[PDB]
């Protein structure tokens with residue numbers, strides 16, 4: 001159980017890209033990699049584990065830095081190679097914490113010296129990672145320049161000048177890689193909990209209608225095909241969240257990756273209309289309130305989320321339909337708030353209402369829908385609604401074994417329920 005399945009090559013115009021070498025079936029795993037470097041992002045920090053990135057109500061805090069919090073003593077140990085150095089820095093920053101991108105790039109710079117190679121850099125190393133120096137706007141260069149003066153500052157302790165780092169390695173150029181080659185680490189419940197750098201995965205170009213999706217069983221990362229992919233076909237993923245219009249997607253892809261998405265979709269404006277059904281006036285105020293809420297989600301702060309959600313869904317009932325992406329986003333948030341708070345009746349109220357949009361927005365098999373759908377069925381089973389629960393849990397499996405695969409332990413939970421939902425229609 002080893003044979004290779006992808007490879008790099010030269011695109012007509014868009015740089016370096018992956019391709020199948022033999023035909024692929026949907027649900028097939030193609031690549032698998034640990035991070036070259038990864039870190040629990042500022043919000044999740046103090047809430048999740050500093051290694052395995054898992055949420056265990058209580059956490060043991062850092063010996064000498066008292067910032068980094070651990071799952072166990074074993075998690076705390078194999079974390080040394082990485083935490084060894086950074087402990088000192090964070091220690092005397094207190095409380096000011098380094099913006100993720102830095103604390104990451106701090107960790108990376110030593111994992112370059114590691115000597116014996118990494119799997120993460122098997123097909124594409126760090127120094128190959130496209131940075132887009134040319135044709136990068138000012139206020140962005142002026143943006144990255146800042147981070148450098150912040151990095152050097154934050155690091156001081158272990159790094160006083162560029163002579164302590166390998167040559168050809170350049171800091172400003174390195175943030176330019178990490179602005180546009182980072183990876184959002186999503187946990188079980190499809191929550192963002194960290195940022196990684198997977199320099200073989202970064203060989204994947206962008207379609208808003210991808211054929212590959214990636215899922216995070218902790219910091220470990222899986223790339224699978226979601227459809228039938230023929231020899232010589234360039235493999236692609238969507239770097240963005242699926243709840244954005246072509247116009248929102250255009251703006252963000254210029255601001256980060258410097259390009260035009262020339263997918264069949266970004267030209268015809270797929271789903272675009274359906275996304276903003278309702279009067280612009282109505283939801284403007286919702287896409288505004290979405291900038292607050294989304295913050296407090298990442299900071300695992302549910303109680304205020306549930307205030308700002310209830311009030312606003314209670315408000316726009318008479319006028320704004322669920323299928324409106326920004327309305328919907330509050331609905332997912334609404335659901336997510338209720339789950340972590342244990343209001344599982346309310347939880348199901350909100351979750352079931354989102355079910356249908358999701359179907360029209362996330363095509364064939366998307367792991368976001370998967371988990372969402374799972375949370376629904378799982379919410380239903382609990383409520384004792386066995387028939388339609390078996391319906392959704394089944395659906396979840398039809399999505400998830402192609403999105404997550406057998407190698408994901410989440411699947412385990414899924415089947416258990418299906419055999420336990422069997423037990424309640426006894």
Ligand SMILES: Nc1ncnc2c1ncn2[C@@H]1O[C@H](CSCC[C@H](N)C(=O)O)[C@@H](O)[C@H]1O
Pocket residue numbers: 014015016017129130132180181202203204205206207256257258259260261262
């Ligand atoms: N759909 C698309 N259209 C045009 N350029 C794209 C694209 N997807 C990715 N890119 C380019 O590739 C970068 C993402 S990294 C993905 C692989 C890239 N060829 C590389 O050398 O690493 C972006 O910053 C952008 O320069």
Ligand SMILES: [Zn+2]
Pocket residue numbers: 062063064065066067068083087
């Ligand atoms: Zn420490």
Ligand SMILES: [Zn+2]
Pocket residue numbers: 049050051052053054070071072075076
């Ligand atoms: Zn841990």
Ligand SMILES: [Zn+2]
Pocket residue numbers: 207208260261262263265266267
């Ligand atoms: Zn596009």
